[PDB]
Design a protein around this ligand. Structure first.
Ligand SMILES: O=C(O)c1cc[nH]c1
Ligand SMILES: O=C(O)c1cc[nH]c1
Ligand SMILES: O=C(O)c1cc[nH]c1
Length: 186
């Protein structure tokens, strides 16, 4: 492990950042791999002590006009606690079936997942969700985020997957998770 190889150190650390902070977009192809194919967050969580706070935020800067809608939809998922019900259908709707083309199509995913229409609409329009949208945007600004996927540890270190072994996916996931473990103990 060397700064600049498996990870980089932030010039201005982020106080108050969670222990593990992930950024993603439902438009981001590597993010689809990280979620559906590799299950990176799950395998990272398995290698950390129990109780460690992992936070995951959506970013606006992919998908054109639909990118902000997805960040707001993710805020709704966070406010309602339904992330594990909508993550897969949102990824598949955007990237696999390409059936998500509008805010209404996003809402359909939540309706199909069992979220009542009135509660989705109330959350979508709530100031709590407006604040969650702002929080996601501020977090990305705090790290001058330029691309996704991205993971930050203790507000101080950024993961660098470009330097990891991609010839074997299990080796990649274990290298990624071990690096997060190393950084979290730093
Ligand atoms: O797709 C884009 O580049 C984008 C969306 C919101 N801001 C930038
Ligand atoms: O950028 C911040 O300050 C932050 C990120 C997650 N919670 C707080
Ligand atoms: O995310 C993938 O598909 C992957 C990771 C290592 N090699 C391929």
């Amino acid at each position: 492990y060397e700064d600049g190889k498996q990870y980089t150190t932030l010039e201005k650390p982020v106080a108050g950042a969670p222990q593990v902070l992930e950024f993603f977009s439902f438009f981001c192809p590597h993010c689809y791999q990280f979620e559906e194919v590799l299950h990176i967050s799950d395998n990272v969580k398995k290698k950390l002590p129990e109780g460690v706070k992992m936070t995951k935020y959506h970013v606006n800067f992919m998908g054109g006009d639909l990118g902000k809608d997805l960040t707001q939809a993710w805020a709704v998922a966070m406010a309602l606690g339904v992330e594990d019900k909508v993550t897969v259908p949102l990824f598949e709707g955007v990237q696999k079936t390409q059936t998500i083309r509008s805010a209404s199509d996003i809402r359909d995913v939540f309706i199909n997942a069992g979220i009542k229409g009135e509660e989705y609409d109330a959350a979508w329009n709530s100031f709590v969700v407006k604040s969650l949208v702002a929080q996601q945007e501020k977090a990305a600004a705090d790290v001058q985020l330029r691309g996704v996927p991205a993971m930050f540890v203790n507000g101080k270190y950024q993961l660098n997957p470009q330097g990891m072994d991609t010839s074997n996916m299990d080796v990649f996931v274990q290298q990624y998770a071990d690096t997060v473990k190393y950084l979290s103990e730093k």
